[PDB]
Design a protein around this ligand. Sequence first.
Ligand code: HPA
Length: 260
Amino acid sequence: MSLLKKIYETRDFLTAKGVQKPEFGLILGSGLGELAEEIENALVLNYADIPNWGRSGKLIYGELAGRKVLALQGRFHYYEGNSMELVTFPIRIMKALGCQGLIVTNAAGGIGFGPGTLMAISDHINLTGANPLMGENLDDFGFRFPDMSNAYTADYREVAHQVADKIGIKLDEGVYIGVSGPSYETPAEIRAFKTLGADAVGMSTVPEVIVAVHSGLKVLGISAITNYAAGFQSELNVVAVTQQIKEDFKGLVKAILVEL
Ligand code: HPA
């Protein structure tokens, strides 16, 4: 089919550009972009130059913390009007290129945790309005009806909390609820999401994680909580606790990369 041939064409392109044997997918959300700096012998490509991909923004291959990583710095957002096929196309590419696991980070609003926290994601709730696997199943990639019981790979999660303790960074853990965006939530919406068991809320991740699961990729997800969700303070700006958290997240992801 159409999608599959794109997947293969973009995979060869990337192979030809020298994208050899990435072990890890790395999606750097809101201000972990910088960490793509520290990537060694980096192949750096603009999104606009990647066939079948286009302008969401860079894709970056090379070595980080001793591992082969395929990093997205700047990521597709559903609220920008990108379909769900295009949002998750980099995830199809990471699998088809041999990646074993995905590390997806993001910035989230805090329901059960407060600003400055880092929250390993233990599960998610998809409230985006859509599911990225709608359409014909991609048999080459996975089953029609994939099990989400273990989406945020419990082995990866244990590794993250060990690394966090051993390096003395506080690592919390909880449930992310994905919404579409791009408006922030009303306080009433935040009360319902709390009732539905969410600990944090943002505008990404869920669809990528679904496709990651379908593709058989293990997954690690971490939210930086950048602010109390609507209702828990009185306005939402200055979500720049992102900066004060920058250095802890960087060292954490690096030291996790070593151990997965
Ligand atoms: O409060 C929020 N809501 C949804 N997404 C977000 N990303 C950062 N903060 C938020």
